[PDB]
Amino acid sequence: VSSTKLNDLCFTNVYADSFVVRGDEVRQIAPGQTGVIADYNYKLPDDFTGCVLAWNSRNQDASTSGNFNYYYRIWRSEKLRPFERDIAHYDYQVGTQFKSSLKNYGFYSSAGDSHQPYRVVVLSFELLNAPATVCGPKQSTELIKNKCVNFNFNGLTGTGVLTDSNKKFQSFQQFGRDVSDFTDSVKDPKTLEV
């Protein structure tokens, strides 16, 4: 989805994933990335539909003495699958010694941006033929019937003539399509009229 179009779209479901990483590991929060975070902590699907937002959180997560409340995994017998979470505490063997698979970050307010804490929020968007629950701040206009108009219904845009429909829709159906995949009908989100 283009970021410039988010204000014109509506989403059936929106999920917000939130965590803290080091500045130089924000690049790994993206599809097809390889690294300690992308492999053993948080993996996105290659067909991901959504937005990754990140910002320097030095003022809230770094301290002069150091903040050691944030942890990341260093080793997992296998790589994580998309949206998989592993919260188990286990040790791994390095040579003859057993070490914790979890390591602590040391966030110091005097460190460079690459070692500052970054708060990351991943917005996963679902766009299905279902009731809209999350929409952009677009103002609705008046319904114009029996004329060629550009239309925008819950993010779905197009050009055509809007007329009263005798078609009946299922409880959560928002739009109807034909064999050609042409949207031949829509439920008005304000009047619930097809």
Next chain:
Amino acid sequence: TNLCPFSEVFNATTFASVYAWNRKRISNCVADYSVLYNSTSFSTFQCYGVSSTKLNDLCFTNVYADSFVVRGDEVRQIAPGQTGVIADYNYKLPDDF
């Protein structure tokens, strides 16, 4: 079964200057980069012509390792089709790299 000697390279006491960059042939070894995560935080890990996620499933006839030191803001120039002091007069990658 022998691990590729990446740890001894990444940890050489001194690397080469970018104008006099070093080339090392890597052969007869297993390339496992996850072993390096404990000692090396890769700010940049970008692959061209091959996906990084597929490297663990692939085998290579020849592997060359070019090593040098640059300033942080000049790491972007180590990539095909880049223009800059490093890309123009120190180290250039081929466009089909």
Next chain:
Amino acid sequence: FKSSLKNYGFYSSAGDSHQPYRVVVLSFELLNAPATVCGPKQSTELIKN
């Protein structure tokens, strides 16, 4: 006349943009020839027919 070579001045107090970065470029050759560098994949048993 000036030297075509300039010296970097790497200070531990500088910002990340002026910190030294070690770069390693791995050039891969994939031809119809003996493999010498492979990933850590376990081999299975050969299944024929």
Next chain:
Amino acid sequence: CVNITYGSHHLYVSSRTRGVYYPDDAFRSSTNVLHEGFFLPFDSNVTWYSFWNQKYSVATSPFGDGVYFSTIDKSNVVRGWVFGTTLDNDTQSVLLYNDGTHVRVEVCTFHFCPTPVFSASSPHLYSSAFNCTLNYTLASVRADFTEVDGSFKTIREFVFKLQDGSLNVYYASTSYVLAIGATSQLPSGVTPLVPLWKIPIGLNITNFKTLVYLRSDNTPLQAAYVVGHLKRRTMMFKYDENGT
């Protein structure tokens, strides 16, 4: 917890044309659509479990690439399932069950009892639960714990699949009259299972176990459930004009 000493009785039956579910969320009308994915193969060998006053048949089953699950009962004996890897306290597990009034999902590190079961509406699933990342109600569905006499009257079918950290649940309910002595057999015909729930569990699932309710005396009731495994196959689906 409840110590169950009753033995286990199981047999092998045919899957027939059961386990068909909507492969996508795209509206398809009056069209024959081909689909390559994980489906229950037609006429496949599936495991049928039967329970009676002297037989309690619940075992840990592999999840694999997905599971077709059906219950043929008359007294709501199957209350839900446990999904996970070790199904113990070294990992998180998914507990999906009906508490009597609501279908609930809990994702925590549960130390489940050797045989997690409900004693006449009374829960005895896990000794302790911690590290809960998910705990919410999926739907309001009244399922009684009463004992109904007579033949089985309904088959409830479920398809469980894992996709991007989410457990996808497909469901269909069809009236299926089966006498207690009648041969163990699934109904004939295609009944498409509709997408019911997409639960964001974020967990790796390799094994699952069925949860049942016993009588106030901890004796097993009369019920049957079937387990089949989804396999990679191409299937052709016929959609009507409604999209069914």
